[PDB]
């Protein structure tokens with residue numbers, strides 16, 4: 723299987739910082755499509771669900787929002803920033819996720835993902851980061867190869883990797 727190598731290849735530019743108990747995480751995905759194509763996967767429910775099945779669009783625009791839906795739980799996630807085909811900031815748990823679509827070439831984009839995880843995050847922070855790394859890998863895969871089989875990943879292994887990254891930030 724190629725799952726381990728695909729995961730490593732997409733973790734290459736993970737970055738972490740700790741400031742005043744808040745963890746900041748950044749990563750990047752090089753995706754062979756235009757920013758306009760990738761923007762649809764953040765702003766249309768049928769595309770958003772291809773990579774993050776629990777999410778749906780609420781509304782778009784400067785007052786837009788996503789919704790997170792599970793059988794036992796629904797929540798709205800207001801946008802904190804919105805620029806068509808450029809960037810999107812969304813409330814996430816007690817912090818923020820941010821998508822920045824950087825054009826590399828007419829059909830190549832660097833999607834720069836960054837996140838703020840305060841100490842009161844409800845999910846253990848390394849598990850939330852592991853989850854984002856996994857679904858961002860799926861986003862790249864569905865944009866480039868729409869019917870590739872999903873990655874059979876080893877969640878505990880990925881979660882441990884991120885545990886060690888965060889633990890290293892402690893003084």
Ligand SMILES: [Mg+2]
Nearest residue numbers: 756757828829
């Ligand atoms: Mg163009």
Ligand SMILES: [Mg+2]
Nearest residue numbers: 724871872873
């Ligand atoms: Mg695969």
